[PDB]
RNA sequence: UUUUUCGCGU
């Protein structure tokens, strides 16, 4: 059979319709609204709802409610009731306090090893006195912390019990009345009934509602824990914890007032909750901005909040009037005392901010602290309909101006890129002035450009310049998402019970009239079930305009997930229209988007430094573009898309939206929101339009053509700049845009620099409003606001050069099984580590992030592993076995010490530490094995009294020696070594490394795809294992193995696309069930995942045997040992390869010795601070930000036309050029490259050589640019902090010329600089004082010479041809003769 | 030179007229032309489907 | 001078063409009033289109704002949106009074609400 | 001279293009639901003529 | 008087422009030969594009 | 329980 595994986090929608239907069927009356949902649920209820109602306890509850003893209420009301629990007992209180004390103590003990290693390297149960003091400080947790932890543990216990029982047997309902005192829970997958006996109140909610309640509890627990840890750290060292600080009494009171507001205003209170953006921004502006801007923003924010509150009250009173919630409205609504409560909330928020930039920036977690609104899909659809199907009036001059601005942008991009005007038909339309610009390829600047020239340019027609790909790109087509069924099958989403009998009969008769592919609802199923598939099908459809007037076109709609704005609806389309839209967006991104650098789909800190810089007056306009999609029509959004259609030589590809959407029906496609069909109507085009569906959209759909709308907005902004005579540095990024307006002015008498920037701002805002009204946008004061020196994007605060982060917002939802599939253990640990790394990377607190990460790691290990849903106790038994093995291996005297060591061992060797020590100093490293070995040595320095200040030596305690021996000696049983190295250049192999889920799921995915209707995927899967063998055999005869060169070969060959698709499929919820129409998970999948997890847990046993696999003798001497040499030998021994080069690199953290004073041996990196102060955290320096970019390789691109070549062809050409550069010294190179070019492209080697960007760099081990090699090495600290220091490298270059002179070196200096910068940041964090300078002396023994080897061998052309022929359906478009002929035409 | 200058001014105004009329042509097609199958006539032939016609004629 | 006099009327007529093209306005191709089909993109002189908007021939959400936009005038709503000092509605006035000033009404009870 | 002749030889072409644009606007705007079928027939006939010309 | 004749014919072209634009406006807000002329145009641009494509093909061959 | 639902995306 198969099991249904529910999710532990909502990751979805708390649908209004499901709650309404459930309540209506339970209580025999309108629960939440008088929609069609309640009527249809009461008439024909769902099977799950009937099962939920037929429970013995549920029947008693309904009988009690009908007798009137208990009063019906709202899910938000019980959310508030649960949050203010006020019902805990003394026994559970003391138990929770003891558990929390144990968790804190264990987390500090675990972090002690990392802190001791860091302190030992820096030279500055628990061994560190700092953490001893921290433990003494955090002995008694605070009452709010115990309260939140108890609530979270109770909710998580309920959820885990329900999930385990549901996995055990399907269709289980959990009835709980003892886990939470005074609360009754009837939680189920399809419903959740909460009953409070003490207050005589009852509701029904959804599983998503219970999930979001648990997430509220977890989020508030995380906020309280993080703030408590930061405050405790700041108590003994003000520069040790997070920059922000709260007493958390204000925070608990703030949560209480927030959910009290939510309860008082019901589900409509999230309108008020969302507007807290305005209040936080106003509080920030009160500190930074000037008097006029701050006053204007404050007044606008007050108006917005009060308008939202009034609208919420009116909507609530209208909605709950003729329902079962008529008498549940609080008396405070009518008399208006809610204004006092809102004022208290705002004052308490301001007090929590405490007039501090750090606190106000960090406060942004309040948005996710409260739950998510129950989005009403029909109401949002009605709003977007009334906004869309409205006639808009455009002046023809305005449309011509916009089109001319777009044309000018296109011409500027073409000139700047290809050094030539595009081929245009209307050469006579231009006057002589523009004809001069056409003949001699230049463009006028904006200063000399004019409205007249924009009008003139609007009548230009171009020839084809960009080429549509003929073969469909499966990587960008295939996805795991869902698609809408055809128009004739739109009823197949809704349940049968809700649909009328005639609709059911019609859909049964019409199913057999549709193919199997379009009868599905998922992308993967749709493309796998296409027996009559064709690679040249999307291209043919686009060319023939098959999407136009297609009878089977429909646009679904569904509420956006985890969004506080209910008016966010996402739409779906059938497969063909989805293909068309995705293709249009893709071509806009590849070809047109690079003419518009202002659009960041591309580090937010970096982008924000871009914005960090008789009188020149500057300004800032920030506009929200949430509703900007719906203001577009064909007359506005397609006058510019016709330019793209002409450039691509295609008709109606970029204008498909406002040519097909108006003729179809926009319908709310949700399970619990069915429309009223009536009788004798079986199609959407004749179904009457109501709140459930409407026709004649006449507008844009969010998401689709987003890049087109952004480039049109950029063109409009350029036109606005031209018409206002001010420079604009707009930086539009998705749904929000920021405008930097600069205009030189002559200052008047009695006017300062201020109050003139305000005048410029007002004039520019008037111009912006007028021009957006002319183009057809009616933006109001709610979306846009005025500023002078604000750089705000993606909810980031930065001014005066200092970046104030919001790390608590994104580390907010950290728990046991986060961002995991099938409750994977290793993936959960990586997710926890990555999320907790945000604190260190943004809030500048290594120790706070370490403590939080260790808290949650210990919770996941020793608290939730025994409660795993799939495997009940096997994971915990394996963990106990591993801990016993570690205790036996080392001299540990306690299983607690064994657990600490396991938590502190790198997960590469089957450990438990997700974040190694290098991540604390530099983000990216050339190799992971060396860093893992260094981390293991540093951790083992905690138990063995070694000293990292000096060189590594040999002592009596040889636990480190035993570890380094067990990792250097092992049995060699390698297979598929070359293909494995091609897949992962850093793979170890021979069972010396953990297995990724894809590595085990590849066979299952291939087996599934073999029995698939799609011939392409079927053949690819059938010829997969043979392709693997051939790929392994291609380059097994090359003496010096280069993993990165093998990766280049892998990328060049067509097997890369097939295996990428296989890997994408491997990430699905359940393999072997895609083609079975079931959402459950197969027992085979469960067993495979369980076996993988058990093997991954029991990996330290194999890596560290209790006999050292060397006859209990011959332990490696520690004296004169190179970690780089040891790691290289381990890799070569694991792969059974004579020599592996170009993949190992010395660990910078281990190599760089640290001394804070200069001497006669000062031959290290010279890093010193330039700011004249003791503390430089949160301050800007005079130097440029340290991006850490790697050295650019030297290339000589040949002079030829590139627009006629597609992106895939250009990528293949670049990969082939890399192959020619790397493997030039190959005995078989000539015919190897000839056959590779003939297979991949339509050209021969001689023809392809003309397009190869020949590389001038002698060494390819230092300058190669594989996707598997890092392109930059940024520091752990953010960009702004690196500006406070200066770095030098001259002593290092002198010493590296004295030794290994005039030759390239394997070490990377960008990582060295980043390590030094983050090193001195950590030093000032731990010592409350920044050193004047730190010196990084290298240990020369790990330094190795890295030179280009001379490969000796022959590439197996037979196997190469076999791979090409087998994977012939994934090759890129061949460069035909008709395309090659124009490659060299000027 | 006066005749040439005013001829150039007339030419510039003619370019004005061409630009406005062409943007009117583009904006005047709309979804209404798509359902009537006249948008191809409104915006003319394009390279891709001309090549399709060519290969159909050869085939 | 004969050629100059002959092309003076050319220039005058061209200027008239450009002026009336400037005054020309175009509407969107939205649905018909009966909502039984789609309507062509109506195009015509500015005054006639304003007349149609006033007579509700072409339905729109904000007729007066349409007149203000087409007549090149600053509407009161636009002025309020881009005013130098934005006003406060009575609810925001009460909220501002409550925020600015120490607590006077007490009511520090979560159970009251 | 040559400049005047060239200027007129561009101006008349511009006027011809303007006349063509006015022609297509008048054709598209007028003939409610009747001229569209004629335009479609003219388009399919033009496609057939292009096919025949390419074959020839 | 070739320049005079050219200016005159431009004058009738402009008058035709006024008449045609006025009738377009009154038709939109308030035939066979025109359709034939616009089809002949569409054909001549389709032939120019085909000429470019066949020139590319013959350069390929 | 017409595959519980799960867009485009960054």
Give a concise summary:
With 1386 residues, chain A is α+β, with helices and mostly antiparallel strands. The chains are: A alpha+beta (1386), B mainly alpha (59).
Characterise this structure:
The complex is a heteropentamer, with one copy of chain A (1386 residues) and four copies of chain B. With 1386 residues, chain A is an alpha+beta fold. Among the domains of chain A are: 1-242, no CATH class; 246-366, no CATH class; 1148-1192 and 1269-1338, no CATH class. Helices cover 48% and strands 6% of the residues of chain A. The longest helix of chain A has 33 residues, at 90-122. Chain A is globular. Chain B is built from three helices and no strands. Chain B is mostly helical and 59 residues long. Chain B is elongated. Chains D and E meet through helix 1 and helix 2 of D and helix 1 and helix 2 of E. Strand 6 of chain A pairs antiparallel with strand 1 (24-27) of chain C. The structure holds one RNA strand of 10 nucleotides. Chain A: Belongs to the paramyxovirus L protein family. Chain A: It comes from Human respiratory syncytial virus A (strain A2). Chain A: The active site is at residue 1262.
Number of β-strand runs of chain A: 25
Distance between the termini of chain B: 58 Å
> Based on DSSP secondary structure assignment, what is the total number of beta strands of chain B?
0
Helix content of chain B: over 70%
Name the overall outline of chain A. Answer: globular
Residues in β-strands, percent of chain A: 5-15%
- List the domain count of chain B as a whole number: 1
State the end-to-end distance of chain A: 66 Å
Radius of gyration of chain A: 33 Å
What proportion of the residues of chain A is helical, as a percent range? 40-55%
Biggest sheet of chain A, in brief?
4 strands, mixed
Separate helix tally of chain A: 57
Quaternary structure state of the chains depicted: heteropentamer
Strand content range of chain B: under 5%
Largest interface: A-C, 61 and 48 residues
- The strand line-up of the biggest sheet of chain A is 2-5-4-3
